[PDB]
């Protein structure tokens, strides 16, 4: 557990994630605060989104608990920061690193999946009125994800 | 009329119909020695109609070797008479009687007949009658480290269930015209060739919805075939298939016929030539007993062994057995003829009780027909076993001394064990230890720890407890009961009510552990198992793990420096459903049950906690405004539960329950259908509500409907409990109050700055001040499945069934809802007995100090199919460090409480390794990539001081060591694993 | 003509393509340059996911357009 977590942390340190920066909170290895940079050619642009990662005691045999802290207007992310990611609930295997999870979350931010949504109203707006969805996403990422 | 309050765990293994049929069967038991009493105990706990005992032989001292209902005051009294009184107390629904004489015709009164400690002629006489009258006949025998079971249920036994697995069911994607049924994406049907299935909710092929079973021809992990469906239709879309289980006919042979041509059951495939030897050996034993006035061969006597071998030769010649007799094994059987071990008795008693249940309930696949077992690997080899040492000493341990000898008895009597948990396995382990004489010497001792209390449902498989003991601590009751069984254990047993975990290290510290000899786990969760395994690995103590699940069981042994630990193996984790599936799109009853549990927690538990915390913590609002993920939710909960919706009577509680019904079963569904209409399509043009997504429909409140009324009653009762009001159950008040209710209008909303903080502040200041409410608290609802008067399971069942009605899912009853929501683990008394027997058979190996890894056996078994298997433990992995052989698990570094710099220099100069990471507990003490200033501040500090500074908590006075995890790189930069560090404070 | 494909890590890959080129050909080029199997490539342009069997012109891709290469995840 501890050795695997430190190996992942060192791997992150050796090769910078460029678009991400994860590190332990204080000195606790089972609580990380990660940062994600919004994709440039998306409404979530010029934005900094903070995520909290809680490694379970049985890591890597149980999925880490990843929750958004910054408010985001996304069909697959609710108000509590819960992320509709398949690799975090039942598809988890002891072979996925935190860098892979961050890349998956960045891809999710790149394009939502409204056919299996978590916030039905946002998904409905996205499917029906695309321009209003874009405007709302830009407003939210300007109000919350900046400063 | 099954008392589900007592058979709660057993019904999940057998079922309602099985137990109903079981409660109409009579069981006769011939022989009341250790095996007979074990069988009777298991049967009585099972719940048969009644039990009758027959054993007129007067008691003898040696009989106490494995009979735990006999005391030294009963010498000279018939065993049945002195055992019936104690057996009658186990279960109040199962009368126990005694018969002084047996007549053949009398046997017609019983459904099953179990025979032990009976000569072969009498067994033949009994079987010749019980076979032709269709009476199940089971014969069991235990000789030292050997055991035999024989079953005969008649010529036309009907077995309804042959494996005990639930019928297989699944969701279909498409069925071609040629019967090719395909499962959904990434879904395995699991069917096997020749199975029968029935289809329902099939679109495009209505003919398959009739329900007639059809043959299955598996074509792959995702597809199978059913034959030709040409007439019914061309292609079928979606639908659900469910397996159908057909009864099987099993034909048994009588004992007289089966003696010549037996049909064996092999408990292990590594030794397949033995059962033919035991078949001759046991018959030779019977002949020898008949030829010496029922006197078995004396322990470790050569003359008797030779005579027994001559009898074996004669029998083999007579029966035309074309098998060469193994002289060593047969003479070993001769030596241990008079042995009587409590472990073997427990194992065979569990097995035979399960066979009795199979005979009565016509369930599971029975043994067919001979089952010969031996644990000869357990015979000690580090002590002297001979005629002089094994002769009886006129004590209650003669049955065990006849197998192990006096020196091994002295070794056992000085053990210092540590038992974790006091559940069913704990009770069986304590019984076995008391019978074996464990820790009865001057230097012996026993320690048992368990923080739980006795409950009604626990009495079904924990025979050391009685209804008068409900509500008391398990450890004290178990210790007192075992002290009663064996008086010599008076003062040698200590009972703790402490949970084994990080917080109890002040009690189970270095001093406590250094004196132990072995640790035995009887836990039911993986966290505690892992913790105890880590403690044993650190302290290098033998560990005995055992687990059960329904009729399945396993036992594992961990030996220092020999095998791997418990944590080196990974088990499948719990399945958690995606949040999106639960929140909006459920398709199975499990999803609705999980949603109902979440609703219960969010309605009756979390808002109450928030209200209580607001009235206690002076600075709760400010902390919540910037700490919680939804301060507005917390403020709204506080307002609603304090001022806005505070009930003044139970009528207001009923109105609130009605409002919540509308909120959760009528309005949210309308909103969802407004966002995604039933005719909407996905981005690819496919219909949205297709496949795993079922279109919901809002519910209209009908008071006459049962489910609606149940939900209203449960919600109102729980709300009244929260506010401490007087609830009621008469339907008249509910019907009167709900008649005058006007539903507020609701229309789905299409949607379409910093003032929000101002609104939050306005809400906050609108709340009453904490000073105005002193001494006022709201009682939260803590989930409790085992109580049927708190409306918890009732509410969960009602909510789950209502949501199932929303999505057209088949509702479940309160039984299945309690099983799913409560995470109830099915349990049986027979499985517990078997695992205890196996663990106690490994315990003697541990005591003897066996070194080779081939002499230990991890065991697995499934009693639903009569499967037993044993495999050698996995050796601990080795590694190369600095050109030396290091054990990955059982090796460590011992260092003083030196400074961090000194530790790094030691690892550099001694092991030639560069330290890159050093951590203790859950804190990162040192990392190679930290800024130089931090390291220069931390380098010259001692390890203890560094840990205290980083963890911000002083070390406890009882702390005597530190366990450090270190990751280091070699000279070339290649990562090399190293064992942990044991800093001595 | 020329197009740009942006990855999840901020990298920009320049490709020489024609408006008539199929999506399969572009995925083949991306596999040749980055080694990512086509089955795992999710190409996005102007908020629409490129589908196999079509051409760039079907998506109105013109001089120096920008695409996104993301992973395949559903649920
Ligand atoms: N960490 C622990 N430390 C000490 N005892 C424990 C620990 N975890 C579980 N136990 C005890 O282990 C025993 C487990 O036995 P068992 O599961 O049969 O009982 P139960 O959990 O009370 O019953 P049931 O599961 O049938 O509702 C219980 O006495 C439980 O108190
Ligand atoms: Mg309990
Ligand atoms: Mg339990």
PDB file of N, CA and C in Angstrom, chain A residues 2-3 6-7 9-10 14 24 27-30 57 61-62 71 76 78-80 82-84 88-91 114-121 123-125 127 132 139 143-144, chain B residues 570 573 575-580 582-585 629-630 633 672 674-676 681-684 688 693 750 752-753 917 919 921-924 929 938 950 965-967 975 977-978:
ATOM      1  N   UNK A   2       1.589   1.467   1.101  1.00  0.00           N
ATOM      2  CA  UNK A   2       2.454   2.639   1.201  1.00  0.00           C
ATOM      3  C   UNK A   2       3.500   2.641   0.096  1.00  0.00           C
ATOM      4  N   UNK A   3       4.099   1.482  -0.171  1.00  0.00           N
ATOM      5  CA  UNK A   3       5.137   1.405  -1.191  1.00  0.00           C
ATOM      6  C   UNK A   3       4.567   1.696  -2.575  1.00  0.00           C
ATOM      7  N   UNK A   6       3.885   5.458  -2.814  1.00  0.00           N
ATOM      8  CA  UNK A   6       5.111   6.227  -2.992  1.00  0.00           C
ATOM      9  C   UNK A   6       5.700   6.019  -4.379  1.00  0.00           C
ATOM     10  N   UNK A   7       5.582   4.811  -4.931  1.00  0.00           N
ATOM     11  CA  UNK A   7       6.045   4.592  -6.295  1.00  0.00           C
ATOM     12  C   UNK A   7       5.263   5.449  -7.279  1.00  0.00           C
ATOM     13  N   UNK A   9       3.757   8.282  -6.560  1.00  0.00           N
ATOM     14  CA  UNK A   9       4.146   9.668  -6.317  1.00  0.00           C
ATOM     15  C   UNK A   9       5.488   9.985  -6.965  1.00  0.00           C
ATOM     16  N   UNK A  10       6.457   9.078  -6.840  1.00  0.00           N
ATOM     17  CA  UNK A  10       7.756   9.286  -7.468  1.00  0.00           C
ATOM     18  C   UNK A  10       7.629   9.324  -8.984  1.00  0.00           C
ATOM     19  N   UNK A  14       8.993  12.276 -11.237  1.00  0.00           N
ATOM     20  CA  UNK A  14      10.014  12.129 -12.269  1.00  0.00           C
ATOM     21  C   UNK A  14       9.539  12.706 -13.598  1.00  0.00           C
ATOM     22  N   UNK A  24       0.514  14.553  -1.861  1.00  0.00           N
ATOM     23  CA  UNK A  24      -0.124  14.279  -0.570  1.00  0.00           C
ATOM     24  C   UNK A  24      -0.481  15.561   0.160  1.00  0.00           C
ATOM     25  N   UNK A  27       1.507  15.602   5.222  1.00  0.00           N
ATOM     26  CA  UNK A  27       2.402  14.456   5.147  1.00  0.00           C
ATOM     27  C   UNK A  27       1.645  13.135   5.110  1.00  0.00           C
ATOM     28  N   UNK A  28       0.331  13.163   4.908  1.00  0.00           N
ATOM     29  CA  UNK A  28      -0.474  11.948   4.896  1.00  0.00           C
ATOM     30  C   UNK A  28      -0.467  11.360   3.491  1.00  0.00           C
ATOM     31  N   UNK A  29      -0.069  10.093   3.378  1.00  0.00           N
ATOM     32  CA  UNK A  29       0.013   9.439   2.079  1.00  0.00           C
ATOM     33  C   UNK A  29      -1.328   8.918   1.585  1.00  0.00           C
ATOM     34  N   UNK A  30      -2.354   8.889   2.435  1.00  0.00           N
ATOM     35  CA  UNK A  30      -3.667   8.392   2.055  1.00  0.00           C
ATOM     36  C   UNK A  30      -4.665   9.518   1.803  1.00  0.00           C
ATOM     37  N   UNK A  57      -7.655   1.826   2.625  1.00  0.00           N
ATOM     38  CA  UNK A  57      -6.631   1.045   3.308  1.00  0.00           C
ATOM     39  C   UNK A  57      -6.207  -0.172   2.499  1.00  0.00           C
ATOM     40  N   UNK A  61      -6.229  -2.616  -4.130  1.00  0.00           N
ATOM     41  CA  UNK A  61      -7.288  -3.597  -4.327  1.00  0.00           C
ATOM     42  C   UNK A  61      -8.680  -2.994  -4.201  1.00  0.00           C
ATOM     43  N   UNK A  62      -8.784  -1.721  -3.835  1.00  0.00           N
ATOM     44  CA  UNK A  62     -10.043  -0.997  -3.836  1.00  0.00           C
ATOM     45  C   UNK A  62      -9.846   0.355  -4.503  1.00  0.00           C
ATOM     46  N   UNK A  71     -16.682  23.773  -8.160  1.00  0.00           N
ATOM     47  CA  UNK A  71     -17.961  23.586  -8.828  1.00  0.00           C
ATOM     48  C   UNK A  71     -17.770  23.568 -10.338  1.00  0.00           C
ATOM     49  N   UNK A  76     -22.001  14.778 -16.228  1.00  0.00           N
ATOM     50  CA  UNK A  76     -21.602  13.581 -15.499  1.00  0.00           C
ATOM     51  C   UNK A  76     -21.028  13.885 -14.122  1.00  0.00           C
ATOM     52  N   UNK A  78     -22.013  15.834 -10.475  1.00  0.00           N
ATOM     53  CA  UNK A  78     -23.118  16.414  -9.727  1.00  0.00           C
ATOM     54  C   UNK A  78     -22.597  17.513  -8.801  1.00  0.00           C
ATOM     55  N   UNK A  79     -23.463  18.006  -7.913  1.00  0.00           N
ATOM     56  CA  UNK A  79     -23.093  19.135  -7.066  1.00  0.00           C
ATOM     57  C   UNK A  79     -22.098  18.736  -5.985  1.00  0.00           C
ATOM     58  N   UNK A  80     -22.083  17.467  -5.589  1.00  0.00           N
ATOM     59  CA  UNK A  80     -21.178  17.001  -4.547  1.00  0.00           C
ATOM     60  C   UNK A  80     -19.796  16.654  -5.078  1.00  0.00           C
ATOM     61  N   UNK A  82     -19.166  14.173  -7.131  1.00  0.00           N
ATOM     62  CA  UNK A  82     -19.091  12.781  -7.545  1.00  0.00           C
ATOM     63  C   UNK A  82     -18.923  12.702  -9.055  1.00  0.00           C
ATOM     64  N   UNK A  83     -18.064  11.788  -9.496  1.00  0.00           N
ATOM     65  CA  UNK A  83     -17.707  11.641 -10.901  1.00  0.00           C
ATOM     66  C   UNK A  83     -18.259  10.313 -11.396  1.00  0.00           C
ATOM     67  N   UNK A  84     -18.956  10.348 -12.530  1.00  0.00           N
ATOM     68  CA  UNK A  84     -19.509   9.138 -13.137  1.00  0.00           C
ATOM     69  C   UNK A  84     -18.422   8.492 -13.990  1.00  0.00           C
ATOM     70  N   UNK A  88     -13.952   3.671 -11.266  1.00  0.00           N
ATOM     71  CA  UNK A  88     -13.892   4.017  -9.854  1.00  0.00           C
ATOM     72  C   UNK A  88     -14.928   3.303  -9.000  1.00  0.00           C
ATOM     73  N   UNK A  89     -15.881   2.591  -9.604  1.00  0.00           N
ATOM     74  CA  UNK A  89     -16.958   1.947  -8.861  1.00  0.00           C
ATOM     75  C   UNK A  89     -16.873   0.428  -8.918  1.00  0.00           C
ATOM     76  N   UNK A  90     -16.871  -0.156 -10.115  1.00  0.00           N
ATOM     77  CA  UNK A  90     -16.887  -1.606 -10.266  1.00  0.00           C
ATOM     78  C   UNK A  90     -15.896  -2.136 -11.289  1.00  0.00           C
ATOM     79  N   UNK A  91     -15.344  -1.293 -12.156  1.00  0.00           N
ATOM     80  CA  UNK A  91     -14.335  -1.714 -13.117  1.00  0.00           C
ATOM     81  C   UNK A  91     -12.921  -1.569 -12.573  1.00  0.00           C
ATOM     82  N   UNK A 114     -23.903  12.347 -22.496  1.00  0.00           N
ATOM     83  CA  UNK A 114     -25.286  12.608 -22.075  1.00  0.00           C
ATOM     84  C   UNK A 114     -26.218  11.418 -22.213  1.00  0.00           C
ATOM     85  N   UNK A 115     -25.802  10.346 -22.888  1.00  0.00           N
ATOM     86  CA  UNK A 115     -26.682   9.195 -23.055  1.00  0.00           C
ATOM     87  C   UNK A 115     -26.840   8.398 -21.767  1.00  0.00           C
ATOM     88  N   UNK A 116     -25.883   8.494 -20.847  1.00  0.00           N
ATOM     89  CA  UNK A 116     -25.966   7.859 -19.532  1.00  0.00           C
ATOM     90  C   UNK A 116     -25.571   8.889 -18.482  1.00  0.00           C
ATOM     91  N   UNK A 117     -26.399   9.906 -18.276  1.00  0.00           N
ATOM     92  CA  UNK A 117     -25.988  11.055 -17.470  1.00  0.00           C
ATOM     93  C   UNK A 117     -26.147  10.804 -15.977  1.00  0.00           C
ATOM     94  N   UNK A 118     -25.545  11.707 -15.201  1.00  0.00           N
ATOM     95  CA  UNK A 118     -25.730  11.752 -13.758  1.00  0.00           C
ATOM     96  C   UNK A 118     -26.558  12.941 -13.303  1.00  0.00           C
ATOM     97  N   UNK A 119     -26.590  14.017 -14.078  1.00  0.00           N
ATOM     98  CA  UNK A 119     -27.422  15.180 -13.807  1.00  0.00           C
ATOM     99  C   UNK A 119     -28.390  15.341 -14.972  1.00  0.00           C
ATOM    100  N   UNK A 120     -29.612  14.815 -14.855  1.00  0.00           N
ATOM    101  CA  UNK A 120     -30.511  14.805 -16.020  1.00  0.00           C
ATOM    102  C   UNK A 120     -30.811  16.177 -16.598  1.00  0.00           C
ATOM    103  N   UNK A 121     -30.908  17.225 -15.779  1.00  0.00           N
ATOM    104  CA  UNK A 121     -31.250  18.537 -16.328  1.00  0.00           C
ATOM    105  C   UNK A 121     -30.130  19.085 -17.205  1.00  0.00           C
ATOM    106  N   UNK A 123     -27.875  17.308 -18.755  1.00  0.00           N
ATOM    107  CA  UNK A 123     -27.836  16.478 -19.953  1.00  0.00           C
ATOM    108  C   UNK A 123     -28.930  16.880 -20.933  1.00  0.00           C
ATOM    109  N   UNK A 124     -30.123  17.189 -20.424  1.00  0.00           N
ATOM    110  CA  UNK A 124     -31.203  17.634 -21.297  1.00  0.00           C
ATOM    111  C   UNK A 124     -30.845  18.941 -21.989  1.00  0.00           C
ATOM    112  N   UNK A 125     -30.282  19.893 -21.242  1.00  0.00           N
ATOM    113  CA  UNK A 125     -29.864  21.152 -21.855  1.00  0.00           C
ATOM    114  C   UNK A 125     -28.799  20.896 -22.912  1.00  0.00           C
ATOM    115  N   UNK A 127     -28.291  18.175 -24.720  1.00  0.00           N
ATOM    116  CA  UNK A 127     -28.816  17.505 -25.906  1.00  0.00           C
ATOM    117  C   UNK A 127     -29.711  18.431 -26.720  1.00  0.00           C
ATOM    118  N   UNK A 132     -26.912  27.242 -25.008  1.00  0.00           N
ATOM    119  CA  UNK A 132     -27.141  27.586 -23.610  1.00  0.00           C
ATOM    120  C   UNK A 132     -26.248  26.761 -22.694  1.00  0.00           C
ATOM    121  N   UNK A 139     -19.850  30.356 -17.958  1.00  0.00           N
ATOM    122  CA  UNK A 139     -20.143  31.173 -16.787  1.00  0.00           C
ATOM    123  C   UNK A 139     -19.679  30.489 -15.508  1.00  0.00           C
ATOM    124  N   UNK A 143     -16.802  31.800 -12.973  1.00  0.00           N
ATOM    125  CA  UNK A 143     -17.169  32.220 -11.626  1.00  0.00           C
ATOM    126  C   UNK A 143     -16.446  31.412 -10.557  1.00  0.00           C
ATOM    127  N   UNK A 144     -16.269  30.110 -10.774  1.00  0.00           N
ATOM    128  CA  UNK A 144     -15.735  29.215  -9.751  1.00  0.00           C
ATOM    129  C   UNK A 144     -14.323  28.727 -10.031  1.00  0.00           C
TER     130      UNK A 144
ATOM    131  N   UNK B 570      -5.480 -12.350  -2.193  1.00  0.00           N
ATOM    132  CA  UNK B 570      -6.515 -11.368  -2.479  1.00  0.00           C
ATOM    133  C   UNK B 570      -7.837 -12.073  -2.741  1.00  0.00           C
ATOM    134  N   UNK B 573     -13.666  -8.412  -4.204  1.00  0.00           N
ATOM    135  CA  UNK B 573     -14.252  -7.354  -3.379  1.00  0.00           C
ATOM    136  C   UNK B 573     -15.768  -7.304  -3.527  1.00  0.00           C
ATOM    137  N   UNK B 575     -19.315  -5.737  -4.620  1.00  0.00           N
ATOM    138  CA  UNK B 575     -19.768  -5.088  -5.844  1.00  0.00           C
ATOM    139  C   UNK B 575     -20.597  -3.860  -5.488  1.00  0.00           C
ATOM    140  N   UNK B 576     -20.149  -2.695  -5.943  1.00  0.00           N
ATOM    141  CA  UNK B 576     -20.867  -1.441  -5.761  1.00  0.00           C
ATOM    142  C   UNK B 576     -21.343  -0.956  -7.121  1.00  0.00           C
ATOM    143  N   UNK B 577     -22.608  -0.576  -7.199  1.00  0.00           N
ATOM    144  CA  UNK B 577     -23.196  -0.195  -8.468  1.00  0.00           C
ATOM    145  C   UNK B 577     -22.829   1.244  -8.820  1.00  0.00           C
ATOM    146  N   UNK B 578     -22.821   1.589 -10.107  1.00  0.00           N
ATOM    147  CA  UNK B 578     -22.546   2.978 -10.487  1.00  0.00           C
ATOM    148  C   UNK B 578     -23.578   3.920  -9.889  1.00  0.00           C
ATOM    149  N   UNK B 579     -23.123   5.117  -9.520  1.00  0.00           N
ATOM    150  CA  UNK B 579     -24.021   6.083  -8.896  1.00  0.00           C
ATOM    151  C   UNK B 579     -25.151   6.455  -9.844  1.00  0.00           C
ATOM    152  N   UNK B 580     -24.861   6.551 -11.142  1.00  0.00           N
ATOM    153  CA  UNK B 580     -25.910   6.898 -12.096  1.00  0.00           C
ATOM    154  C   UNK B 580     -26.990   5.826 -12.150  1.00  0.00           C
ATOM    155  N   UNK B 582     -27.988   3.820  -9.708  1.00  0.00           N
ATOM    156  CA  UNK B 582     -28.828   3.917  -8.520  1.00  0.00           C
ATOM    157  C   UNK B 582     -29.694   5.169  -8.547  1.00  0.00           C
ATOM    158  N   UNK B 583     -29.118   6.299  -8.949  1.00  0.00           N
ATOM    159  CA  UNK B 583     -29.806   7.576  -8.800  1.00  0.00           C
ATOM    160  C   UNK B 583     -31.035   7.662  -9.696  1.00  0.00           C
ATOM    161  N   UNK B 584     -30.915   7.244 -10.950  1.00  0.00           N
ATOM    162  CA  UNK B 584     -31.969   7.498 -11.927  1.00  0.00           C
ATOM    163  C   UNK B 584     -32.455   6.255 -12.657  1.00  0.00           C
ATOM    164  N   UNK B 585     -31.575   5.302 -12.957  1.00  0.00           N
ATOM    165  CA  UNK B 585     -31.887   4.200 -13.869  1.00  0.00           C
ATOM    166  C   UNK B 585     -31.590   2.858 -13.211  1.00  0.00           C
ATOM    167  N   UNK B 629     -19.439  20.044   1.552  1.00  0.00           N
ATOM    168  CA  UNK B 629     -19.607  20.181   0.112  1.00  0.00           C
ATOM    169  C   UNK B 629     -20.906  20.878  -0.274  1.00  0.00           C
ATOM    170  N   UNK B 630     -21.831  21.067   0.664  1.00  0.00           N
ATOM    171  CA  UNK B 630     -23.109  21.721   0.381  1.00  0.00           C
ATOM    172  C   UNK B 630     -23.604  22.409   1.642  1.00  0.00           C
ATOM    173  N   UNK B 633     -27.365  22.843   1.755  1.00  0.00           N
ATOM    174  CA  UNK B 633     -28.102  21.657   2.174  1.00  0.00           C
ATOM    175  C   UNK B 633     -28.159  21.552   3.692  1.00  0.00           C
ATOM    176  N   UNK B 672     -37.916  13.525 -14.161  1.00  0.00           N
ATOM    177  CA  UNK B 672     -37.060  12.695 -15.001  1.00  0.00           C
ATOM    178  C   UNK B 672     -37.681  12.477 -16.373  1.00  0.00           C
ATOM    179  N   UNK B 674     -39.741  14.461 -17.785  1.00  0.00           N
ATOM    180  CA  UNK B 674     -39.690  15.740 -18.483  1.00  0.00           C
ATOM    181  C   UNK B 674     -38.329  15.950 -19.131  1.00  0.00           C
ATOM    182  N   UNK B 675     -37.256  15.564 -18.439  1.00  0.00           N
ATOM    183  CA  UNK B 675     -35.924  15.699 -19.019  1.00  0.00           C
ATOM    184  C   UNK B 675     -35.704  14.702 -20.151  1.00  0.00           C
ATOM    185  N   UNK B 676     -36.131  13.454 -19.965  1.00  0.00           N
ATOM    186  CA  UNK B 676     -35.948  12.391 -20.954  1.00  0.00           C
ATOM    187  C   UNK B 676     -37.292  11.734 -21.233  1.00  0.00           C
ATOM    188  N   UNK B 681     -34.613   9.743 -28.036  1.00  0.00           N
ATOM    189  CA  UNK B 681     -33.620   8.853 -28.619  1.00  0.00           C
ATOM    190  C   UNK B 681     -32.232   9.335 -28.223  1.00  0.00           C
ATOM    191  N   UNK B 682     -31.281   8.406 -28.251  1.00  0.00           N
ATOM    192  CA  UNK B 682     -29.906   8.725 -27.907  1.00  0.00           C
ATOM    193  C   UNK B 682     -29.255   9.504 -29.049  1.00  0.00           C
ATOM    194  N   UNK B 683     -27.959   9.782 -28.900  1.00  0.00           N
ATOM    195  CA  UNK B 683     -27.238  10.500 -29.941  1.00  0.00           C
ATOM    196  C   UNK B 683     -27.038   9.655 -31.192  1.00  0.00           C
ATOM    197  N   UNK B 684     -27.139   8.333 -31.080  1.00  0.00           N
ATOM    198  CA  UNK B 684     -26.976   7.435 -32.214  1.00  0.00           C
ATOM    199  C   UNK B 684     -28.299   7.048 -32.859  1.00  0.00           C
ATOM    200  N   UNK B 688     -33.968   5.876 -26.160  1.00  0.00           N
ATOM    201  CA  UNK B 688     -33.249   6.093 -24.909  1.00  0.00           C
ATOM    202  C   UNK B 688     -33.603   5.029 -23.879  1.00  0.00           C
ATOM    203  N   UNK B 693     -32.170   0.444 -19.287  1.00  0.00           N
ATOM    204  CA  UNK B 693     -32.948   1.569 -18.788  1.00  0.00           C
ATOM    205  C   UNK B 693     -34.429   1.284 -18.995  1.00  0.00           C
ATOM    206  N   UNK B 750     -38.103  23.762 -16.445  1.00  0.00           N
ATOM    207  CA  UNK B 750     -37.168  23.677 -17.558  1.00  0.00           C
ATOM    208  C   UNK B 750     -35.864  24.418 -17.294  1.00  0.00           C
ATOM    209  N   UNK B 752     -33.904  27.489 -17.544  1.00  0.00           N
ATOM    210  CA  UNK B 752     -33.879  28.787 -18.208  1.00  0.00           C
ATOM    211  C   UNK B 752     -33.401  29.859 -17.236  1.00  0.00           C
ATOM    212  N   UNK B 753     -24.795  35.681  -9.295  1.00  0.00           N
ATOM    213  CA  UNK B 753     -23.836  36.591  -8.682  1.00  0.00           C
ATOM    214  C   UNK B 753     -23.531  36.155  -7.250  1.00  0.00           C
ATOM    215  N   UNK B 917      12.782   6.620   0.279  1.00  0.00           N
ATOM    216  CA  UNK B 917      11.533   6.909   0.968  1.00  0.00           C
ATOM    217  C   UNK B 917      11.492   6.134   2.274  1.00  0.00           C
ATOM    218  N   UNK B 919       8.689   5.775   5.612  1.00  0.00           N
ATOM    219  CA  UNK B 919       7.379   6.131   6.135  1.00  0.00           C
ATOM    220  C   UNK B 919       7.065   5.260   7.339  1.00  0.00           C
ATOM    221  N   UNK B 921       3.505   4.185   9.583  1.00  0.00           N
ATOM    222  CA  UNK B 921       2.069   4.295   9.729  1.00  0.00           C
ATOM    223  C   UNK B 921       1.408   4.790   8.461  1.00  0.00           C
ATOM    224  N   UNK B 922       0.926   6.032   8.480  1.00  0.00           N
ATOM    225  CA  UNK B 922       0.295   6.633   7.312  1.00  0.00           C
ATOM    226  C   UNK B 922       0.930   7.988   7.029  1.00  0.00           C
ATOM    227  N   UNK B 923       2.161   8.185   7.495  1.00  0.00           N
ATOM    228  CA  UNK B 923       2.860   9.454   7.362  1.00  0.00           C
ATOM    229  C   UNK B 923       4.167   9.250   6.610  1.00  0.00           C
ATOM    230  N   UNK B 924       4.525  10.230   5.785  1.00  0.00           N
ATOM    231  CA  UNK B 924       5.762  10.190   5.007  1.00  0.00           C
ATOM    232  C   UNK B 924       6.849  10.890   5.814  1.00  0.00           C
ATOM    233  N   UNK B 929      12.877  13.528  -2.622  1.00  0.00           N
ATOM    234  CA  UNK B 929      12.549  14.676  -3.456  1.00  0.00           C
ATOM    235  C   UNK B 929      12.089  15.886  -2.651  1.00  0.00           C
ATOM    236  N   UNK B 938      14.935  18.185   9.376  1.00  0.00           N
ATOM    237  CA  UNK B 938      14.515  16.886   9.885  1.00  0.00           C
ATOM    238  C   UNK B 938      15.652  15.885  10.048  1.00  0.00           C
ATOM    239  N   UNK B 950       6.033  14.840  13.203  1.00  0.00           N
ATOM    240  CA  UNK B 950       5.249  14.774  11.973  1.00  0.00           C
ATOM    241  C   UNK B 950       3.801  14.402  12.271  1.00  0.00           C
ATOM    242  N   UNK B 965       8.415   1.432   6.994  1.00  0.00           N
ATOM    243  CA  UNK B 965       8.484   0.946   5.625  1.00  0.00           C
ATOM    244  C   UNK B 965       9.472   1.807   4.852  1.00  0.00           C
ATOM    245  N   UNK B 966      10.415   1.162   4.173  1.00  0.00           N
ATOM    246  CA  UNK B 966      11.512   1.851   3.507  1.00  0.00           C
ATOM    247  C   UNK B 966      11.585   1.385   2.061  1.00  0.00           C
ATOM    248  N   UNK B 967      11.662   2.340   1.138  1.00  0.00           N
ATOM    249  CA  UNK B 967      11.925   2.076  -0.270  1.00  0.00           C
ATOM    250  C   UNK B 967      13.276   2.676  -0.628  1.00  0.00           C
ATOM    251  N   UNK B 975      15.439  -0.167  -8.506  1.00  0.00           N
ATOM    252  CA  UNK B 975      14.670  -0.325  -7.280  1.00  0.00           C
ATOM    253  C   UNK B 975      14.759  -1.763  -6.787  1.00  0.00           C
ATOM    254  N   UNK B 977      13.385  -4.202  -3.450  1.00  0.00           N
ATOM    255  CA  UNK B 977      12.540  -4.298  -2.268  1.00  0.00           C
ATOM    256  C   UNK B 977      13.341  -4.811  -1.078  1.00  0.00           C
ATOM    257  N   UNK B 978      13.034  -4.276   0.098  1.00  0.00           N
ATOM    258  CA  UNK B 978      13.714  -4.665   1.333  1.00  0.00           C
ATOM    259  C   UNK B 978      12.678  -4.857   2.430  1.00  0.00           C
TER     260      UNK B 978
END
